[PDB]
Amino acid sequence: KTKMVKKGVLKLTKAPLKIVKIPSGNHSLIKNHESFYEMGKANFMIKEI
Amino acid sequence: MSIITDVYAREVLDSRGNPTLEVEVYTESGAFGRGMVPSGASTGEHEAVELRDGDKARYGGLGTQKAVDNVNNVIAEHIIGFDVRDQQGIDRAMIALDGTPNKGKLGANAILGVSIAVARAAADYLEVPLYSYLGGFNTKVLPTPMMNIINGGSHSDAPIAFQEFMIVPAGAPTFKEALRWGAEIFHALKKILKERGLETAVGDEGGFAPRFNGTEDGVETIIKAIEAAGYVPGKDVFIGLDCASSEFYDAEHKVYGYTKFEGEGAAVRTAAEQIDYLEELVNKYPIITIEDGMDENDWDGWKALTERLGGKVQLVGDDFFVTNTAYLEKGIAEHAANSILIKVNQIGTLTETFDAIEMAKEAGYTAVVSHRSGETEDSTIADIAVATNAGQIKTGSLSRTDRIAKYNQLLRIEDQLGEVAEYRGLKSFYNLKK
Amino acid sequence: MSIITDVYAREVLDSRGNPTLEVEVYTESGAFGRGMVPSGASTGEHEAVELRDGDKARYGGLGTQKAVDNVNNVIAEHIIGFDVRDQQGIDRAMIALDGTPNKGKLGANAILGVSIAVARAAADYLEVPLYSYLGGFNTKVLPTPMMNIINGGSHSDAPIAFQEFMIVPAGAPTFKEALRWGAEIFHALKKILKERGLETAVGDEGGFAPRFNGTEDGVETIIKAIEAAGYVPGKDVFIGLDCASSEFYDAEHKVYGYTKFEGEGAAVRTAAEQIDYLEELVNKYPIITIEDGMDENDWDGWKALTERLGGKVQLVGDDFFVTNTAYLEKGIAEHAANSILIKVNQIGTLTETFDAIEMAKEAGYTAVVSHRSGETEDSTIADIAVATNAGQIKTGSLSRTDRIAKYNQLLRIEDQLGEVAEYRGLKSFYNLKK
Amino acid sequence: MSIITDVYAREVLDSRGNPTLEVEVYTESGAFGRGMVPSGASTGEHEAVELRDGDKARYGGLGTQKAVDNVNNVIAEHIIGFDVRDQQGIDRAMIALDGTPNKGKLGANAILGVSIAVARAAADYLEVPLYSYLGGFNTKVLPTPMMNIINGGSHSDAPIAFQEFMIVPAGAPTFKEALRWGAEIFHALKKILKERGLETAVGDEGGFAPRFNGTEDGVETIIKAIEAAGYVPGKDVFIGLDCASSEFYDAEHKVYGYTKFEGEGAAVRTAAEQIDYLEELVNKYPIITIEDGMDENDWDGWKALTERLGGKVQLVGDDFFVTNTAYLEKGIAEHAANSILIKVNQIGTLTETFDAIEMAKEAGYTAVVSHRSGETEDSTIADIAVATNAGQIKTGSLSRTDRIAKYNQLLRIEDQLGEVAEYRGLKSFYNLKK
Amino acid sequence: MSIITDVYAREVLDSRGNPTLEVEVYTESGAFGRGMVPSGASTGEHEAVELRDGDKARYGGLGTQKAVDNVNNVIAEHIIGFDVRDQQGIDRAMIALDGTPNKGKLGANAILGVSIAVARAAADYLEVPLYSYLGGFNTKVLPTPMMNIINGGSHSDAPIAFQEFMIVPAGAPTFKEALRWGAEIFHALKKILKERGLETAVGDEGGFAPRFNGTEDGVETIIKAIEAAGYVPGKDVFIGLDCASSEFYDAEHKVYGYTKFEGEGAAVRTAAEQIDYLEELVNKYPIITIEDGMDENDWDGWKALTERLGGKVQLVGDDFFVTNTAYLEKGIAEHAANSILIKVNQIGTLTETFDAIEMAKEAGYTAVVSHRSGETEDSTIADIAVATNAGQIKTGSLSRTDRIAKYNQLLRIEDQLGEVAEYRGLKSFYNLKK
Amino acid sequence: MSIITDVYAREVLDSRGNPTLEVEVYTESGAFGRGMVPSGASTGEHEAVELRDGDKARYGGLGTQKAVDNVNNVIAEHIIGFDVRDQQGIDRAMIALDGTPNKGKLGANAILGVSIAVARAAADYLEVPLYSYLGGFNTKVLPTP
Amino acid sequence: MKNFKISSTYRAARKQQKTANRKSFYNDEGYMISPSEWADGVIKGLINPKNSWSNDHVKGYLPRVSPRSHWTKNGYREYLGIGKSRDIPEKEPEVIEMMDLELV
Ligand SMILES: [Mg+2]
Ligand SMILES: [Mg+2]
Ligand SMILES: [Mg+2]
Ligand SMILES: [Mg+2]
């Protein structure tokens, strides 16, 4: 019944908008005003300590 | 948009194989209405008379081509251009165009067909149910059916003077249940009559006319059918009568000669003895209705019958009032009867039908919308009964689509009304006391 | 296109300067209906109660912000999505949502305003007059107006115990002529009061409240005004009374004490003495109707009054029945009064108002559609009176537009009806004889 | 705009007082169609069966609430969304949704009601007459009616084994004249039976069931009625038979036993003797039609009867073919009969009805649109007969609105067609030589 | 679709029981407008005169059948065919058709009724609020009401020469608050007069006429009512006067004889003494408005009064200007008054009313839209006051629908405008310094 | 039918060759209104300021792409939904959306273009002359030039 | 859904692409079944006839939904999803973090 049509849908959860004061400016986490995060996303940096 | 563009009549057949007419009304926007006229009487002292051809080479003189031509060549030109929602104006214009008290010039059938067709076309234009258009927003009461089940008098050859015996399922919760009860009692009576070797083929109204021993035999067989179906007489289903005493009434001897239908050994009763006989029947059987218990001219007898029995049994005047407003007003003033049988073709228009119904209601009387011997597939009288909230209908037995069409229309009305639909049963007899 | 899309409410003022509410209904296609509510009573054991804010800082505690919020927040979300022509369903839904026998949760004013607004929006959607939508195609009778002329009791400082005196121009040929006769008698009485030194300022209902020497002086002055206008008392114009005997009834001693409003020397009457005094007034003056002749809880005295005077004089139960179905049924069964005063805000729903009207009609009673002391520019009760063909209305005197609006609406209705309109006059008092 | 948005079934009554159902289809733009189902058979190996409740408490196990729920819950969800003019697609979808050869899961009554309601709603949307929508632009032929006038067999206690006797007014110029001739012959027969002392009450199909001495007596009385009306037997009016020979067929001994209905002394006839008897009846009387002259399983007897009488007498297979395309194809291949009786509820769908009519017509057979014992106010079979240009109909006698409605619809169709309307009469029997 | 199709007038009563007319305008697409004319005066040298019949046998010579006949038989034939939005064209065509400067041939009432009906039909056709159609998009200012709370002069038997005393709630934040304050002050004064023993029954405009000792006593009682309601005189609520100084001005000796109303002990004042009296009243009490403080023909007295008090109080010319742009031009030129009372029926059309309002605005004068003594349920003057952003209205007291209807319409307009709505209050007196 | 569905601004030229902007407003039934803004001053103590690009490469710093983007991306979403005849409500909503007394955030030119376009579209929807829509029925005086 | 309605263009696309004539049916577990077993299960009560079918697919990325309108107190038209709403948005959550080595 829950048919997968074409490549499917995008999973977009809702969590409060947060802005990071990165040393380049002010980077908002999302580009939409309806507070739509891409659920399951993260970033990483890997070093060789 | 609602201006009447076309009025057209044609000649069709009624339920008895006799000709009647039907009228179709078309407006500018395409709203359509069709009204079919029941077969009435071409003779009458103060009742609206229908127009018959009188050509003995066509339908035995019962053709309706003259009234069809009256609609097509006289009424149509007068009515085309009117607003379809001007029912009172159209009916008044047709009455003035006829110019006679009994509607004899144009024919009561022609005028009634145009009235019904105009009302149905106006309901079609407004996209409302016909009963909503006719009776306004507050139309909820499904009439209590008074179903004819056994015929006597001139409708049968059995020794019974009374013309109709009927079952009134006034103890049912809804109209659907009342119809199911009536159908089951009808089939139980059919089984009982088959067991007794009596005839089962139905009459004009769909009821039986068996060879009974007398009135008491027929009433007792009806009670047996009620109990075989599984219902209590006097609590769930009651009995009504249509004596039609004008048929066996000696005008000059002032007696009710039962010998015309019950053999030479019958009882020739005066008006007083007829009152005691009806009181005996009411005290013996669960009889809640008596129709035409006295002659149409026995005004003193009607007053005495209303004094004796008017508080416990409904007394209906069919030929007593012949849906005439003058007769109904006189009967109200003289305290004769407490119910009037409403026949739309005996008066001529829907406006005067509703006027008679409201005059009867305002005086405490009950209006019973009634069928005729020759009916059609048209079921406007069910919409009339619901629209006026009359609470009672007399539309025949449970055996021919001339009668079953009205019951089907009442089922449709009840389904449409839904939770606001009301069936009152014994409460519909507001002319009675307790 | 007929789906109710928007239900707004706001707080407005009534004719007394006290707050009330009004409700606007928009359907999908843009059909619009506005219903204003007359001011009622927030207290009462067996009448629908209206919701007041109770904030003594605003309007002396008489504001209607709570019921306006009930319409805007509670009722609107339930009603939106309904069909505007489903008046019975909408009314039943509002009654169920209130969940109280006296409609005390949402308020009777809120429910009545939504009912009137829905009915008017449905009439606007169908492009038909409001009386045509409410009562169907057979709406023709212009009501006979019993219009207030003189006040007493608690409405005046005069030594008169009877609350209201009314003129009924039942001898008029049309409603237009009846209104003209009423206006001319009103002005003639104004001139007579001016020439006598009495004050001609009007009260809440538009009638004068002068100081007299008693009831007999008031009726004599009204008869003198009727003759001075050029009309015959007892043939052209009749006198109506509204005693409001509940105001001067002592329940402990079971006596009607006129000493409350007529001074120390007034006579104290029992039930039999009160009936005798009403009978002498009827036999002395052309009095055709008496309203609240006995106390609202004096069922035996009401029955005796109907036994004596109920054949020739109309007896209207205003506080006796309080437009309650149960009280009307009990009075019909007990033969108490022969008329009911119908106030639409005493129940709070058009469906129940029409149900009460038909129940009173079926018993031989007359329904008198009545105004309230705090009225609005809404003139729906005129269309209610015409739609039901009640034949009697009571909308105050011939002064403040809160009364004149209903008379103007009846003039409009008569003009649209044209040749169809009927003014029965004395014939609308069908509850009497001959 | 033509997309179906609502399918709703409700349980109504039929012409015999037994429950059936009706379906209503509403499309997006407001086009409305109503289809009522004639009562058929819930049992049968090779014909479509109807769905009955079987609850003995309600209607003696004949309720149709199960099939109403099948329409409202199963068929409604599938059909809502289709284009209303997709009659074949909707019908095939319903057949696939049922999944059984006999349509026993959903019920043949349910499927047929939805089929008729969809066809009528499509005709209403297109604003065209139903016969024009069903059969195309070339709809001109008015069927020659076979009017049942005398009943025997299982429908009468007389010693007659033939179930029905019919009059065929094939000598009329138009259908209107044919209907007038049938009604006048009906009334002449009624007068003859009244003079003879025989019973005149009508049965299920509107005809009489008198107590004749035999088949010859009934045919002679029919001829006397024809001549009393002023018409010539064998030129103006012919005689048809419905033997229903399967009822008095002794299958074990392969013999036709007339002793079942015609008394103990009745003759016993084999297949050859039965052919000889039918041929003798054809020679003695103006018989143009014989229906079910042999048993539904006597294929060799049917072949011999068609070889002997098929060139001059119409032989109709009612129980022989059961509106079955397979049985009709087998009969066409084996030269059995030259006509088929078409009952819409025996097949369950308008598409399959028209397929059977087309198959019959392409083989030189005539298709006779027929009625059932329990009919309704639905007159769709008249539109089916005119739409297919079948040229013959069998819709009962001239005495009940379950039969008169089809004749009235045929009169309306003839009036609509005007000059285009055709009545072949004897030329509608194209299966017969010359 | 906007072309005027029907113009129909009928005679209806007003708030005083006197006849007037109402005009209904119907356009081609069905847009409807109704205009009801307030009762003015049929006399006056430079005032537009209404047309009365003079038939002393009908309504005492105050019937409006002649104006109704003028609309139906003269105006309608000229106006039908116009575009409904051509308000200026229709008004100028009616003015030219009448042909007289005072609109005496057709009656100013007929012209005004047609103008209002056309304007409202044009607003209905455009589906816009009436104030939006009349005044454009920038309509936001709710007028500051001068509620007539106490009467006098020719409207009372007390020894007060000043005709009206009014309360001006100029300190309220919104119009809703101002109306609530006015109603509460009205009820507080009602209670004060009841406990003092004076009269309570309302007058022509809803105000009281008690038995005061003089002007100072009445103003002091009004201040006591303002303080008892809980508001601050001179900061929240102010006093206004309608002296009607032309009633007690004797042109023979050029004096203002107060002895006409205030008894033999009153003071006879010259123009300088009258200005001194008005100035001392302004100093004593928080009086912001003085209307008709000088005789309508005392131009030097008016100029001296505007020189003395025109900087701090608002001097309104009611009988001075007579809604006549000629007299306004003269007054603006000679610096006589600082405001004009605008009575729409004193000029005859909406176009000339708006021309007078714009001429008053261009001179720094304020325009006060006013009621009449005989008002109706029509509430167009509220839409005129809002549409012109006049900022002031004089529509009566807080106790009769003829007055409450305009306040209710203003409440509706404020609710509709929402946050855009503005109530300037004291800032609406832009004709005064500080 | 009367509800604003599309608000689109584009950059055009004025009578002096300097840039300005125009706004097109489309309602549901197809009513159309176009408003052009006269070139004013972007500096002032107590006057409404227009919004210029300041990019000296394009048009000498007098470009109007900023105001066009403000209409297309800020004003249009806020205004779509309103009735086209709700001129006062639309103007008050734009004033509140800007938030500054001098209308310097969105730009006075952008707000004026939307205001004029909405009024013209409302006059087009009602099928009335623009002066009739703006001033009511009593509009008759031709100005002295 | 009261704030929105089915768009007319999508309704037309669904109409004469005839997607309603190619319905798919599912049981209570949402597995595709033939119309015969769907009818069988609905009759025996093992399937809910309401939520157990689909109207194929409309081709072409059309918007399924348009805003629904209503009437204001002024008698004007207005979208149902616009209005006073509420007023609670704060500004943001500035989380500093001026040390993250952002990859190019
Ligand atoms: Mg009878
Ligand atoms: Mg009372
Ligand atoms: Mg057969
Ligand atoms: Mg004045």
From TrEMBL, chain G:
Chain intervals with Basic residues compositional bias: 12-21
Domain of life where this protein originates: Viruses
Location of the region described as Disordered in the Swiss-Prot/TrEMBL record: 1-21
Biased composition (Polar residues): 1-10
Entry protein name: Uncharacterized protein
Organism of this sequence: Streptococcus phage CHPC1156
